[PDB]
Design a protein around this ligand. Structure first.
Ligand SMILES: Cc1cc2nc3c(=O)[nH]c(=O)nc-3n(C[C@H](O)[C@H](O)[C@H](O)COP(=O)(O)O)c2cc1C
Ligand SMILES: Cc1cc2nc3c(=O)[nH]c(=O)nc-3n(C[C@H](O)[C@H](O)[C@H](O)COP(=O)(O)O)c2cc1C
Ligand SMILES: O=S(=O)(O)c1ccc(/N=N/c2ccc(O)c3ccccc23)cc1
Ligand SMILES: O=S(=O)(O)c1ccc(/N=N/c2ccc(O)c3ccccc23)cc1
Lengths: 210, 210
Protein backbone atom coordinates (compact mmCIF):
# COMPACT_ATOMS: atom_id res chain seq x y z
CA UNK A 1 0.00 0.00 0.00
CA UNK A 2 1.40 3.31 -1.17
CA UNK A 3 0.26 6.47 0.60
CA UNK A 4 0.76 10.04 -0.62
CA UNK A 5 0.98 12.60 2.19
CA UNK A 6 0.21 15.76 0.24
CA UNK A 7 0.69 18.94 2.29
CA UNK A 8 -0.06 22.51 1.38
CA UNK A 9 1.12 24.46 4.32
CA UNK A 10 4.22 26.67 4.31
CA UNK A 11 4.66 25.93 8.04
CA UNK A 12 5.69 22.66 9.64
CA UNK A 13 3.86 20.77 12.38
CA UNK A 14 5.41 23.22 14.95
CA UNK A 15 3.47 26.18 13.60
CA UNK A 16 0.43 24.72 11.79
CA UNK A 17 -2.66 23.12 13.35
CA UNK A 18 -3.38 21.10 10.20
CA UNK A 19 0.21 19.84 9.94
CA UNK A 20 0.18 18.81 13.64
CA UNK A 21 -2.89 16.70 13.10
CA UNK A 22 -1.64 15.35 9.72
CA UNK A 23 1.70 14.30 11.22
CA UNK A 24 -0.15 12.60 14.14
CA UNK A 25 -2.31 10.80 11.58
CA UNK A 26 0.66 9.70 9.49
CA UNK A 27 2.77 8.47 12.47
CA UNK A 28 -0.14 6.50 13.86
CA UNK A 29 -0.78 5.09 10.42
CA UNK A 30 2.87 4.04 10.01
CA UNK A 31 2.83 2.20 13.38
CA UNK A 32 -0.23 0.24 12.31
CA UNK A 33 1.23 -0.50 8.88
CA UNK A 34 5.05 -0.62 9.11
CA UNK A 35 5.43 -2.07 5.60
CA UNK A 36 3.35 0.64 3.87
CA UNK A 37 5.21 3.21 1.83
CA UNK A 38 4.48 6.84 2.63
CA UNK A 39 5.81 9.54 0.35
CA UNK A 40 5.53 13.18 1.29
CA UNK A 41 4.68 15.64 -1.42
CA UNK A 42 5.06 19.12 0.01
CA UNK A 43 3.28 21.26 -2.57
CA UNK A 44 5.29 24.31 -1.42
CA UNK A 45 8.52 22.45 -2.48
CA UNK A 46 7.32 20.45 -5.45
CA UNK A 47 7.22 21.68 -8.96
CA UNK A 48 3.53 21.81 -9.84
CA UNK A 49 3.21 23.59 -13.21
CA UNK A 50 0.19 25.78 -13.68
CA UNK A 51 -1.65 25.16 -16.90
CA UNK A 52 -0.54 28.07 -19.12
CA UNK A 53 0.23 28.95 -22.78
CA UNK A 54 3.27 26.66 -22.77
CA UNK A 55 1.13 23.78 -21.54
CA UNK A 56 -1.64 24.39 -24.10
CA UNK A 57 0.99 24.67 -26.85
CA UNK A 58 2.55 21.38 -25.69
CA UNK A 59 -0.87 19.64 -25.67
CA UNK A 60 -1.54 20.97 -29.18
CA UNK A 61 1.63 19.35 -30.43
CA UNK A 62 0.74 16.02 -28.77
CA UNK A 63 -2.73 16.22 -30.34
CA UNK A 64 -1.10 16.83 -33.73
CA UNK A 65 0.81 13.54 -33.22
CA UNK A 66 4.16 15.29 -32.55
CA UNK A 67 6.58 13.98 -29.91
CA UNK A 68 8.33 15.38 -26.83
CA UNK A 69 11.21 16.88 -28.87
CA UNK A 70 8.76 19.16 -30.67
CA UNK A 71 8.41 21.09 -27.39
CA UNK A 72 10.61 23.99 -26.32
CA UNK A 73 12.84 23.37 -23.26
CA UNK A 74 10.44 25.24 -20.92
CA UNK A 75 7.51 23.22 -22.30
CA UNK A 76 9.38 19.99 -21.74
CA UNK A 77 10.14 20.96 -18.13
CA UNK A 78 6.50 21.79 -17.43
CA UNK A 79 5.06 18.66 -19.07
CA UNK A 80 7.67 16.41 -17.48
CA UNK A 81 6.83 17.73 -14.03
CA UNK A 82 3.07 17.37 -14.78
CA UNK A 83 3.49 13.75 -15.94
CA UNK A 84 5.54 12.93 -12.85
CA UNK A 85 2.84 14.29 -10.50
CA UNK A 86 0.12 12.50 -12.45
CA UNK A 87 1.89 9.18 -12.51
CA UNK A 88 2.77 9.38 -8.79
CA UNK A 89 -0.89 10.09 -8.06
CA UNK A 90 -2.38 7.36 -10.28
CA UNK A 91 -0.05 4.72 -8.82
CA UNK A 92 -0.66 5.42 -5.13
CA UNK A 93 -3.46 3.69 -3.23
CA UNK A 94 -4.17 6.31 -0.53
CA UNK A 95 -4.13 10.13 -0.48
CA UNK A 96 -3.90 12.30 2.61
CA UNK A 97 -4.34 16.07 1.96
CA UNK A 98 -3.45 18.70 4.54
CA UNK A 99 -4.62 22.25 3.93
CA UNK A 100 -5.36 25.44 5.81
CA UNK A 101 -8.35 27.61 4.94
CA UNK A 102 -7.22 30.89 3.42
CA UNK A 103 -10.07 33.19 2.32
CA UNK A 104 -12.65 30.41 2.25
CA UNK A 105 -10.58 28.02 0.20
CA UNK A 106 -7.20 26.26 -0.05
CA UNK A 107 -3.79 27.58 -1.16
CA UNK A 108 -3.58 28.11 -4.93
CA UNK A 109 -1.08 25.26 -5.32
CA UNK A 110 -3.78 22.73 -4.35
CA UNK A 111 -5.72 23.80 -7.44
CA UNK A 112 -2.57 23.59 -9.50
CA UNK A 113 -2.10 20.05 -8.19
CA UNK A 114 -5.66 19.03 -9.03
CA UNK A 115 -5.15 20.44 -12.52
CA UNK A 116 -2.07 18.15 -12.84
CA UNK A 117 -3.93 15.04 -11.63
CA UNK A 118 -7.31 15.36 -13.43
CA UNK A 119 -6.41 14.39 -17.01
CA UNK A 120 -8.65 12.97 -19.79
CA UNK A 121 -7.87 9.37 -20.71
CA UNK A 122 -5.80 8.93 -17.55
CA UNK A 123 -7.93 9.73 -14.49
CA UNK A 124 -11.32 10.26 -16.14
CA UNK A 125 -12.91 9.53 -19.50
CA UNK A 126 -15.76 10.93 -21.58
CA UNK A 127 -18.95 8.84 -21.93
CA UNK A 128 -22.47 9.18 -23.40
CA UNK A 129 -24.00 10.34 -20.10
CA UNK A 130 -20.92 12.41 -19.15
CA UNK A 131 -17.40 12.11 -17.65
CA UNK A 132 -16.57 9.22 -15.28
CA UNK A 133 -13.48 8.60 -13.10
CA UNK A 134 -10.90 5.96 -14.07
CA UNK A 135 -9.33 5.48 -10.66
CA UNK A 136 -10.37 2.37 -8.66
CA UNK A 137 -9.18 1.02 -5.29
CA UNK A 138 -8.42 4.48 -3.87
CA UNK A 139 -9.15 6.21 -0.57
CA UNK A 140 -8.60 9.80 0.49
CA UNK A 141 -8.48 11.82 3.70
CA UNK A 142 -8.70 15.59 3.85
CA UNK A 143 -7.50 17.32 7.04
CA UNK A 144 -8.38 21.02 6.94
CA UNK A 145 -7.58 23.64 9.55
CA UNK A 146 -9.84 26.68 9.76
CA UNK A 147 -10.11 29.71 12.06
CA UNK A 148 -13.88 29.56 12.08
CA UNK A 149 -16.32 26.66 12.13
CA UNK A 150 -17.54 25.37 8.73
CA UNK A 151 -17.82 21.56 9.16
CA UNK A 152 -21.65 21.45 9.62
CA UNK A 153 -24.56 23.87 9.35
CA UNK A 154 -24.98 27.00 7.26
CA UNK A 155 -21.30 27.91 6.89
CA UNK A 156 -20.61 24.55 5.20
CA UNK A 157 -21.77 26.31 2.03
CA UNK A 158 -18.67 28.55 2.06
CA UNK A 159 -16.18 25.74 2.83
CA UNK A 160 -15.02 25.89 -0.80
CA UNK A 161 -11.64 24.18 -0.36
CA UNK A 162 -13.17 21.17 1.29
CA UNK A 163 -16.07 20.91 -1.12
CA UNK A 164 -14.17 21.50 -4.34
CA UNK A 165 -11.45 19.02 -3.33
CA UNK A 166 -14.01 16.28 -2.54
CA UNK A 167 -15.73 17.03 -5.84
CA UNK A 168 -12.57 16.62 -7.94
CA UNK A 169 -11.55 13.50 -6.08
CA UNK A 170 -14.98 12.02 -6.75
CA UNK A 171 -14.86 13.06 -10.34
CA UNK A 172 -11.62 11.15 -10.84
CA UNK A 173 -13.14 8.08 -9.15
CA UNK A 174 -11.98 8.42 -5.52
CA UNK A 175 -15.45 8.38 -3.88
CA UNK A 176 -14.23 6.92 -0.60
CA UNK A 177 -13.13 9.95 1.38
CA UNK A 178 -12.73 10.96 4.95
CA UNK A 179 -12.69 14.44 6.40
CA UNK A 180 -11.19 15.83 9.61
CA UNK A 181 -11.66 19.49 10.56
CA UNK A 182 -9.36 21.26 12.97
CA UNK A 183 -11.67 24.18 13.51
CA UNK A 184 -12.65 27.16 15.63
CA UNK A 185 -9.18 28.10 16.94
CA UNK A 186 -9.53 31.74 15.92
CA UNK A 187 -13.15 31.94 17.11
CA UNK A 188 -12.02 30.58 20.48
CA UNK A 189 -8.23 31.07 21.01
CA UNK A 190 -8.27 29.84 24.68
CA UNK A 191 -9.78 26.53 23.47
CA UNK A 192 -7.19 26.13 20.65
CA UNK A 193 -4.97 23.57 22.48
CA UNK A 194 -8.04 21.46 23.33
CA UNK A 195 -9.34 21.69 19.75
CA UNK A 196 -5.99 20.52 18.46
CA UNK A 197 -5.70 17.59 20.92
CA UNK A 198 -9.24 16.43 20.15
CA UNK A 199 -8.41 16.51 16.42
CA UNK A 200 -5.16 14.66 17.09
CA UNK A 201 -7.12 11.97 18.94
CA UNK A 202 -9.66 11.76 16.11
CA UNK A 203 -6.79 11.37 13.58
CA UNK A 204 -5.13 8.65 15.63
CA UNK A 205 -8.31 6.59 15.79
CA UNK A 206 -8.94 7.03 12.07
CA UNK A 207 -5.39 5.88 11.35
CA UNK A 208 -6.26 2.44 12.78
CA UNK A 209 -9.09 2.00 10.25
CA UNK A 210 -7.86 3.91 7.24
CA UNK B 1 -13.95 55.81 -12.91
CA UNK B 2 -11.08 53.34 -12.84
CA UNK B 3 -11.72 49.78 -14.14
CA UNK B 4 -9.52 46.72 -13.76
CA UNK B 5 -9.86 44.18 -16.56
CA UNK B 6 -8.46 41.11 -14.81
CA UNK B 7 -7.99 38.09 -17.11
CA UNK B 8 -6.97 34.56 -16.20
CA UNK B 9 -6.79 32.80 -19.52
CA UNK B 10 -3.54 31.78 -21.22
CA UNK B 11 -5.24 32.30 -24.64
CA UNK B 12 -6.28 35.56 -26.24
CA UNK B 13 -9.73 36.56 -27.51
CA UNK B 14 -9.06 34.70 -30.77
CA UNK B 15 -8.87 31.28 -29.01
CA UNK B 16 -10.88 31.70 -25.81
CA UNK B 17 -14.65 31.94 -25.50
CA UNK B 18 -14.38 33.86 -22.20
CA UNK B 19 -11.81 36.29 -23.60
CA UNK B 20 -13.94 36.93 -26.72
CA UNK B 21 -16.85 37.90 -24.54
CA UNK B 22 -14.68 39.88 -22.08
CA UNK B 23 -13.07 41.81 -24.93
CA UNK B 24 -16.50 42.58 -26.33
CA UNK B 25 -17.59 43.76 -22.90
CA UNK B 26 -14.59 45.91 -22.20
CA UNK B 27 -14.41 47.57 -25.63
CA UNK B 28 -18.17 48.33 -25.52
CA UNK B 29 -17.63 49.75 -22.04
CA UNK B 30 -14.74 52.00 -23.15
CA UNK B 31 -16.71 53.25 -26.08
CA UNK B 32 -19.65 54.14 -23.74
CA UNK B 33 -17.29 55.81 -21.25
CA UNK B 34 -14.28 57.23 -23.18
CA UNK B 35 -12.97 59.14 -20.20
CA UNK B 36 -12.85 56.04 -17.91
CA UNK B 37 -9.46 54.52 -17.20
CA UNK B 38 -9.18 50.78 -17.95
CA UNK B 39 -6.11 48.86 -16.91
CA UNK B 40 -5.61 45.25 -17.99
CA UNK B 41 -4.14 42.86 -15.50
CA UNK B 42 -3.31 39.61 -17.25
CA UNK B 43 -2.75 37.20 -14.32
CA UNK B 44 -0.66 34.91 -16.56
CA UNK B 45 1.86 37.77 -17.06
CA UNK B 46 1.67 39.56 -13.68
CA UNK B 47 3.70 38.76 -10.62
CA UNK B 48 1.20 37.43 -8.13
CA UNK B 49 3.20 35.97 -5.22
CA UNK B 50 1.71 32.94 -3.52
CA UNK B 51 1.52 33.22 0.29
CA UNK B 52 4.47 31.07 1.41
CA UNK B 53 7.14 30.82 4.18
CA UNK B 54 8.81 33.99 2.94
CA UNK B 55 5.53 35.90 3.11
CA UNK B 56 4.66 34.63 6.61
CA UNK B 57 8.19 35.50 7.76
CA UNK B 58 7.81 39.00 6.26
CA UNK B 59 4.45 39.51 7.97
CA UNK B 60 5.98 38.36 11.30
CA UNK B 61 8.62 41.04 11.05
CA UNK B 62 5.96 43.72 10.29
CA UNK B 63 3.93 42.49 13.28
CA UNK B 64 7.08 42.79 15.42
CA UNK B 65 7.25 46.45 14.35
CA UNK B 66 10.27 45.93 12.02
CA UNK B 67 10.57 47.67 8.68
CA UNK B 68 11.02 46.65 5.05
CA UNK B 69 14.83 46.42 5.43
CA UNK B 70 14.47 43.60 7.91
CA UNK B 71 13.30 41.40 5.00
CA UNK B 72 15.57 39.31 2.80
CA UNK B 73 15.75 40.29 -0.87
CA UNK B 74 13.30 37.59 -1.97
CA UNK B 75 10.90 38.62 0.78
CA UNK B 76 11.11 42.24 -0.33
CA UNK B 77 10.33 41.25 -3.95
CA UNK B 78 7.31 39.18 -2.89
CA UNK B 79 5.89 41.74 -0.52
CA UNK B 80 6.47 44.61 -2.99
CA UNK B 81 4.55 42.77 -5.73
CA UNK B 82 1.76 41.88 -3.22
CA UNK B 83 1.42 45.52 -2.10
CA UNK B 84 1.30 46.70 -5.72
CA UNK B 85 -1.56 44.28 -6.56
CA UNK B 86 -3.40 45.24 -3.37
CA UNK B 87 -3.03 48.98 -3.91
CA UNK B 88 -4.08 48.71 -7.57
CA UNK B 89 -7.17 46.74 -6.47
CA UNK B 90 -8.20 49.04 -3.58
CA UNK B 91 -7.93 52.16 -5.73
CA UNK B 92 -10.02 50.96 -8.67
CA UNK B 93 -13.81 51.43 -8.74
CA UNK B 94 -14.77 48.47 -10.96
CA UNK B 95 -13.46 44.90 -11.46
CA UNK B 96 -14.07 42.69 -14.46
CA UNK B 97 -12.82 39.07 -14.05
CA UNK B 98 -12.49 36.68 -17.02
CA UNK B 99 -11.95 32.98 -16.23
CA UNK B 100 -12.40 29.57 -17.79
CA UNK B 101 -13.70 26.60 -15.79
CA UNK B 102 -10.95 24.04 -15.22
CA UNK B 103 -11.97 21.06 -13.12
CA UNK B 104 -14.96 22.81 -11.57
CA UNK B 105 -13.08 25.95 -10.58
CA UNK B 106 -10.79 28.74 -11.86
CA UNK B 107 -7.07 28.74 -12.66
CA UNK B 108 -4.88 28.69 -9.55
CA UNK B 109 -3.61 32.21 -10.16
CA UNK B 110 -7.12 33.56 -9.44
CA UNK B 111 -6.83 32.21 -5.93
CA UNK B 112 -3.30 33.64 -5.62
CA UNK B 113 -4.72 37.00 -6.70
CA UNK B 114 -7.56 36.89 -4.15
CA UNK B 115 -4.96 36.02 -1.51
CA UNK B 116 -3.10 39.25 -2.52
CA UNK B 117 -6.22 41.41 -2.38
CA UNK B 118 -7.97 40.13 0.80
CA UNK B 119 -5.86 41.65 3.56
CA UNK B 120 -6.74 42.43 7.20
CA UNK B 121 -6.88 46.15 7.98
CA UNK B 122 -6.91 47.02 4.26
CA UNK B 123 -9.84 45.27 2.57
CA UNK B 124 -11.60 43.73 5.58
CA UNK B 125 -11.50 44.12 9.37
CA UNK B 126 -12.31 41.94 12.37
CA UNK B 127 -15.65 42.64 14.11
CA UNK B 128 -17.63 41.30 17.13
CA UNK B 129 -19.96 39.34 14.82
CA UNK B 130 -17.13 38.47 12.46
CA UNK B 131 -15.10 39.96 9.60
CA UNK B 132 -16.58 42.62 7.29
CA UNK B 133 -15.38 44.33 4.12
CA UNK B 134 -13.73 47.74 4.05
CA UNK B 135 -14.30 48.43 0.36
CA UNK B 136 -17.21 50.71 -0.57
CA UNK B 137 -18.40 52.00 -3.95
CA UNK B 138 -17.16 49.02 -5.94
CA UNK B 139 -18.82 46.87 -8.58
CA UNK B 140 -17.67 43.60 -10.17
CA UNK B 141 -18.47 41.48 -13.19
CA UNK B 142 -17.43 37.87 -13.56
CA UNK B 143 -17.45 36.36 -17.09
CA UNK B 144 -16.87 32.60 -16.96
CA UNK B 145 -16.64 30.16 -19.86
CA UNK B 146 -17.55 26.52 -19.18
CA UNK B 147 -17.88 23.37 -21.29
CA UNK B 148 -21.02 22.24 -19.46
CA UNK B 149 -23.96 24.20 -18.10
CA UNK B 150 -23.74 25.31 -14.42
CA UNK B 151 -25.39 28.75 -14.30
CA UNK B 152 -28.71 27.60 -12.83
CA UNK B 153 -30.21 24.39 -11.44
CA UNK B 154 -28.51 21.47 -9.70
CA UNK B 155 -25.05 21.87 -11.22
CA UNK B 156 -24.76 25.40 -9.81
CA UNK B 157 -23.61 23.66 -6.62
CA UNK B 158 -20.37 22.61 -8.34
CA UNK B 159 -19.65 25.97 -9.99
CA UNK B 160 -16.91 26.54 -7.40
CA UNK B 161 -14.96 29.23 -9.26
CA UNK B 162 -17.98 31.41 -9.71
CA UNK B 163 -19.21 30.88 -6.17
CA UNK B 164 -15.91 31.26 -4.36
CA UNK B 165 -15.02 34.38 -6.33
CA UNK B 166 -18.36 36.02 -5.49
CA UNK B 167 -17.91 35.03 -1.87
CA UNK B 168 -14.48 36.65 -1.52
CA UNK B 169 -15.60 39.75 -3.40
CA UNK B 170 -18.54 40.05 -1.01
CA UNK B 171 -16.31 39.47 1.94
CA UNK B 172 -14.07 42.43 1.01
CA UNK B 173 -17.18 44.60 0.56
CA UNK B 174 -17.94 44.26 -3.15
CA UNK B 175 -21.51 42.95 -2.91
CA UNK B 176 -22.62 44.42 -6.26
CA UNK B 177 -21.60 41.75 -8.75
CA UNK B 178 -22.79 40.71 -12.18
CA UNK B 179 -22.29 37.36 -13.81
CA UNK B 180 -22.16 36.26 -17.43
CA UNK B 181 -21.79 32.62 -18.35
CA UNK B 182 -20.51 31.49 -21.74
CA UNK B 183 -21.68 27.91 -21.34
CA UNK B 184 -22.53 24.60 -22.95
CA UNK B 185 -20.03 24.76 -25.87
CA UNK B 186 -18.61 21.35 -25.12
CA UNK B 187 -22.04 19.83 -24.44
CA UNK B 188 -23.18 21.16 -27.81
CA UNK B 189 -20.21 21.92 -30.13
CA UNK B 190 -22.42 22.68 -33.13
CA UNK B 191 -24.13 25.43 -31.12
CA UNK B 192 -20.86 26.90 -29.87
CA UNK B 193 -20.77 29.86 -32.22
CA UNK B 194 -24.35 30.77 -31.41
CA UNK B 195 -23.66 30.46 -27.69
CA UNK B 196 -20.64 32.78 -28.11
CA UNK B 197 -22.54 35.38 -30.11
CA UNK B 198 -25.43 35.38 -27.64
CA UNK B 199 -22.96 35.94 -24.78
CA UNK B 200 -21.20 38.65 -26.80
CA UNK B 201 -24.59 40.38 -27.25
CA UNK B 202 -25.36 40.02 -23.53
CA UNK B 203 -21.95 41.54 -22.63
CA UNK B 204 -22.49 44.52 -25.04
CA UNK B 205 -25.84 45.32 -23.52
CA UNK B 206 -24.48 45.03 -19.95
CA UNK B 207 -21.69 47.41 -20.87
CA UNK B 208 -24.28 50.16 -21.37
CA UNK B 209 -25.50 49.75 -17.80
CA UNK B 210 -22.40 48.71 -15.85
C1 LIG C 1 -3.98 34.20 4.64
C2 LIG C 1 -4.94 33.61 5.62
C3 LIG C 1 -6.30 33.51 5.27
C4 LIG C 1 -7.22 32.97 6.16
N1 LIG C 1 -8.55 32.88 5.77
C5 LIG C 1 -9.50 32.33 6.62
C6 LIG C 1 -10.86 32.21 6.26
O1 LIG C 1 -11.25 32.58 5.16
N2 LIG C 1 -11.77 31.65 7.16
C7 LIG C 1 -11.33 31.23 8.41
O2 LIG C 1 -12.10 30.75 9.24
N3 LIG C 1 -10.00 31.34 8.76
C8 LIG C 1 -9.07 31.88 7.90
N4 LIG C 1 -7.73 31.99 8.30
C9 LIG C 1 -7.33 31.45 9.63
C10 LIG C 1 -6.79 30.04 9.33
O3 LIG C 1 -7.70 29.21 8.62
C11 LIG C 1 -6.36 29.32 10.62
O4 LIG C 1 -5.41 30.14 11.19
C12 LIG C 1 -5.81 27.92 10.36
O5 LIG C 1 -5.51 27.23 11.54
C13 LIG C 1 -4.57 27.90 9.49
O6 LIG C 1 -4.20 26.56 9.22
P1 LIG C 1 -2.81 26.00 9.88
O7 LIG C 1 -2.85 26.31 11.37
O8 LIG C 1 -2.71 24.50 9.71
O9 LIG C 1 -1.65 26.70 9.26
C14 LIG C 1 -6.80 32.52 7.43
C15 LIG C 1 -5.46 32.63 7.78
C16 LIG C 1 -4.52 33.17 6.90
C17 LIG C 1 -3.10 33.20 7.37
C1 LIG D 1 -7.91 21.93 -18.15
C2 LIG D 1 -9.37 22.07 -18.51
C3 LIG D 1 -10.33 21.75 -17.55
C4 LIG D 1 -11.69 21.87 -17.82
N1 LIG D 1 -12.63 21.55 -16.84
C5 LIG D 1 -13.97 21.65 -17.09
C6 LIG D 1 -14.92 21.35 -16.11
O1 LIG D 1 -14.57 20.98 -15.00
N2 LIG D 1 -16.28 21.47 -16.37
C7 LIG D 1 -16.66 21.89 -17.62
O2 LIG D 1 -17.85 21.97 -17.88
N3 LIG D 1 -15.73 22.21 -18.60
C8 LIG D 1 -14.38 22.08 -18.34
N4 LIG D 1 -13.45 22.41 -19.31
C9 LIG D 1 -13.94 22.93 -20.62
C10 LIG D 1 -13.71 24.47 -20.58
O3 LIG D 1 -14.25 24.99 -19.38
C11 LIG D 1 -14.24 25.15 -21.86
O4 LIG D 1 -13.38 24.71 -22.89
C12 LIG D 1 -14.21 26.66 -21.88
O5 LIG D 1 -14.46 27.13 -23.17
C13 LIG D 1 -12.85 27.22 -21.48
O6 LIG D 1 -12.84 28.62 -21.48
P1 LIG D 1 -12.10 29.45 -22.62
O7 LIG D 1 -12.70 28.99 -23.97
O8 LIG D 1 -12.45 30.89 -22.43
O9 LIG D 1 -10.62 29.29 -22.50
C14 LIG D 1 -12.10 22.33 -19.08
C15 LIG D 1 -11.14 22.63 -20.07
C16 LIG D 1 -9.77 22.52 -19.78
C17 LIG D 1 -8.77 22.90 -20.84
O1 LIG E 1 -16.03 31.57 13.64
S1 LIG E 1 -16.06 33.01 13.29
O2 LIG E 1 -17.46 33.40 13.01
O3 LIG E 1 -15.55 33.84 14.41
C1 LIG E 1 -15.14 33.34 12.01
C2 LIG E 1 -13.76 33.35 12.18
C3 LIG E 1 -12.95 33.65 11.10
C4 LIG E 1 -13.52 33.94 9.86
N1 LIG E 1 -12.68 34.25 8.80
N2 LIG E 1 -11.67 34.92 9.10
C5 LIG E 1 -10.73 35.30 8.15
C6 LIG E 1 -11.16 35.58 6.85
C7 LIG E 1 -10.25 35.97 5.87
C8 LIG E 1 -8.87 36.10 6.14
O4 LIG E 1 -8.01 36.48 5.14
C9 LIG E 1 -8.34 35.82 7.50
C10 LIG E 1 -6.98 35.93 7.82
C11 LIG E 1 -6.54 35.64 9.11
C12 LIG E 1 -7.45 35.25 10.10
C13 LIG E 1 -8.82 35.13 9.82
C14 LIG E 1 -9.30 35.40 8.54
C15 LIG E 1 -14.89 33.94 9.67
C16 LIG E 1 -15.71 33.64 10.76
O1 LIG F 1 -22.85 19.36 -20.00
S1 LIG F 1 -22.21 18.03 -19.84
O2 LIG F 1 -23.03 17.23 -18.90
O3 LIG F 1 -22.15 17.33 -21.15
C1 LIG F 1 -20.72 18.18 -19.25
C2 LIG F 1 -19.66 18.48 -20.11
C3 LIG F 1 -18.37 18.61 -19.60
C4 LIG F 1 -18.13 18.43 -18.22
N1 LIG F 1 -16.83 18.55 -17.71
N2 LIG F 1 -15.87 18.27 -18.47
C5 LIG F 1 -14.51 18.34 -18.14
C6 LIG F 1 -14.11 18.11 -16.83
C7 LIG F 1 -12.77 18.19 -16.46
C8 LIG F 1 -11.73 18.48 -17.38
O4 LIG F 1 -10.42 18.54 -16.98
C9 LIG F 1 -12.07 18.73 -18.82
C10 LIG F 1 -11.10 19.02 -19.79
C11 LIG F 1 -11.49 19.25 -21.12
C12 LIG F 1 -12.84 19.19 -21.50
C13 LIG F 1 -13.83 18.89 -20.56
C14 LIG F 1 -13.50 18.66 -19.21
C15 LIG F 1 -19.18 18.14 -17.36
C16 LIG F 1 -20.47 18.01 -17.87
Amino acid sequence: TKVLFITANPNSAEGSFGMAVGEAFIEAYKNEHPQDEVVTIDLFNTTVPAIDADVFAAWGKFAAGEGFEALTEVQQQKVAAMNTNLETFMNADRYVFVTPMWNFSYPPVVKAYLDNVAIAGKTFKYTENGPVGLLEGKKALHIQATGGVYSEGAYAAVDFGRNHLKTVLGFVGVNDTEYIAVEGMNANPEKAQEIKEAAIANARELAKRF
